[PDB]
């Protein structure tokens, strides 16, 4: 039996970020089922940062994370965590009212957000079919996140603070014993006053082991693929391109193009594989919007974006289950919100007020709590 102050289940971006901030204050042990911490959703994302995405809570958590991403502590990473990648949202269906509403809402959080005419959008991504383009919004402040460096920075930070990150440690049994939570894995047993449930799409399964009422988390499959651009076009500086109705996105990645139908098909938590229909739909939508020809994609994959009913993230203690803390419902936002989520969850776990910089973005206990869910 190994004792800790905080026992975290899951070493994806959620558990790693929460563990990182906790590790400054006590002994953290993170238990991870897989052989590597980023095998599931955290290693399968499109890795983009944009404030104007998701619910108001998500936008606040994303905005509040930028300070850390732009100024992490010395030794956290070797190179910047963010690289410039503006986002251009293109109207392909001639909906000027919706385009205006997205522009106005985005500009309220991003003063530099711009409204583009069709010619401006096509100047930026010249493969757009001009007769299908009706205008766009443009966020000059978007960025790509180096997920590997961020995730490894969190994990290394735990270990440098005398915490432990234990892979091949699937939590199999969980029990409240003598005022603490005890977790049995095949390799070893662990005890801590606080159990942090950061198990991604499996958070409700972890609650099931513990006898704690689950949240109603719904994992949803999203597939993506990479394909080669035609030999004559340099697309490496293109923005992240999204359609106005979120039917697809397309962004440069490692000399290739990364596409997705931006799907969200509800599934059980599992090691999710891409579906042929997903890939074909994404290819069709990109070929409908652009002059690109997509041959058989060179690599395809899928990951899970897991949501509760209201689309907001969850960080808070369970009602009626002492010491059981949810870090859940990251949706499609877990990487871009991870700095604010990690710092806020650590404060809440420790029963401390949220730091002032988070409060200035409108973050508080109530907006994050699982107890807002009803019934
Ligand atoms: C295609 C695509 C594209 C994007 C995105 C997703 C997808 C699929 N996302 C979303 C992002 O991927 C998602 O929000 C986070 O990776 C969720 O991180 P978690 O740590 O919650 O889950 P994650 O699945 O990474 O970690 C949970 C961990 O818990 C472990 N676990 C489960 N059960 C266990 C047990 N019994 N014992 C021990 N360990 C256990 C798992 O093995 C797993 O490693 C995204 N986000 C974003 O911010 N920007 C973006 O651009 C995108 N884009």
From Swiss-Prot:
Q: Per the entry, what induces it?
A: Induced by growth on D-arginine, D-lysine and 2-ketoarginine (2-KA), but not on L-arginine. Repressed by DauR. ArgR could be a transcriptional activator of the dauBAR operon in response to the presence of L-Arg.
What are its cofactors? FAD
Q: Where is this site: Important for specificity toward positively charged substrates?
A: 87
Which residues are listed for FAD binding in this entry? Answer: 14, 32-33, 41-48, 171, 331-336
Q: What happens when the gene is disrupted?
A: Cells lacking this gene are unable to grow on D-arginine or D-lysine as sole nitrogen source.
Under the GO molecular function aspect, what terms does this record hold? D-amino-acid dehydrogenase activity; nucleotide binding
**GO BP term, example:** arginine catabolic process
Function of the molecule: DauA is highly expressed within the cystic fibrosis (CF) lung, and it is required for virulence via the optimal production of hydrogen cyanide, pyocyanine, pyoverdine, rhamnolipid and alginate during biofilm formation. Involved in the catabolism of D-lysine and D-arginine. Under aerobic conditions, the arginine succinyltransferase (AST) and arginine transaminase (ATA) pathways are 2 major routes for L-arginine utilization as the sole source of carbon and nitrogen. The D-to-L racemization of arginine by DauA and DauB is necessary, before to be channeled into the AST and/or ATA pathways.
Q: How does it assemble?
A: Monomer.
Query: Which protein family is named in the record?
Result: Belongs to the FAD-dependent glycerol-3-phosphate dehydrogenase family.
Q: Which PANTHER family match?
A: FAD-DEPENDENT OXIDOREDUCTASE DOMAIN-CONTAINING PROTEIN 1 (PTHR13847:SF287), SARCOSINE DEHYDROGENASE-RELATED (PTHR13847)
Name used for this protein in its record: FAD-dependent catabolic D-arginine dehydrogenase DauA
Natural source organism:
Pseudomonas aeruginosa (strain ATCC 15692 / DSM 22644 / CIP 104116 / JCM 14847 / LMG 12228 / 1C / PRS 101 / PAO1)
Q: Which gene encodes it?
A: dauA
């Amino acid at each position: 039996m190994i004792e800790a102050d905080y026992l975290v289940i899951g070493a994806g971006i959620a558990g790693a970020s929460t563990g990182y901030w906790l590790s400054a204050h006590g002994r953290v042990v993170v238990l991870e089922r897989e052989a590597q911490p980023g095998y599931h959703s955290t290693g399968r994302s499109a890795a983009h940062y944009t404030v104007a995405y998701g619910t108001p809570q998500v936008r606040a958590l994303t905005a509040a994370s930028r300070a850390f991403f732009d100024n992490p502590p010395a030794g956290f990473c070797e190179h910047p965590l963010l690289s410039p990648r503006p986002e251009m949202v293109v109207d392909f269906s001639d909906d000027p009212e919706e385009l205006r509403r997205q522009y106005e809402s985005g500009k309220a959080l991003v003063p530099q957000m711009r409204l583009l005419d069709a010619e401006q959008a096509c100047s930026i991504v010249p493969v757009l079919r001009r007769d299908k383009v009706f205008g766009a919004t443009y966020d000059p402040t978007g960025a790509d996140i180096d997920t590997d460096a961020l995730h490894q920075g969190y994990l290394r930070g735990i270990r440098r603070n005398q915490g432990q990150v234990l892979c091949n440690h699937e939590a199999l049994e969980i029990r409240r014993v003598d005022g603490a939570w005890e977790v049995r894995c095949d390799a070893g047993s662990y005890r801590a006053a606080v159990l942090v449930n950061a198990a991604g799409a499996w958070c409700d399964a972890i609650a099931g082991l513990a006898g704690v009422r689950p949240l109603g988390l719904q994992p949803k499959r999203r597939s993506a693929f990479i394909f080669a651009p035609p030999p004559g076009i340099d697309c490496h500086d293109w923005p992240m391109l999204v359609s106005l109705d979120e039917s697809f996105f397309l962004k440069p990645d490692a000399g290739m193009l990364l596409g997705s139908p931006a799907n969200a098909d509800p599934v059980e938590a599992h090691d999710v594989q891409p579906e042929q229909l997903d890939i074909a739909t994404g290819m069709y939508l990109i070929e409908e919007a652009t002059t690109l020809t997509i041959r058989r994609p060179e690599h395809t994959w899928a990951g899970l974006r897991s949501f509760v009913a209201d689309g907001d993230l969850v960080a808070g203690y369970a009602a009626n289950a002492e010491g059981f803390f949810w870090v859940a419902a990251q949706g499609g936002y877990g990487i871009q919100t991870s700095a604010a989520m990690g710092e806020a969850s650590a404060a809440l776990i420790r029963h401390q007020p949220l730091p002032a910089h988070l409060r200035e973005h409108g973050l508080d206990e109530a907006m994050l709590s699982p107890r807002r869910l009803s019934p």
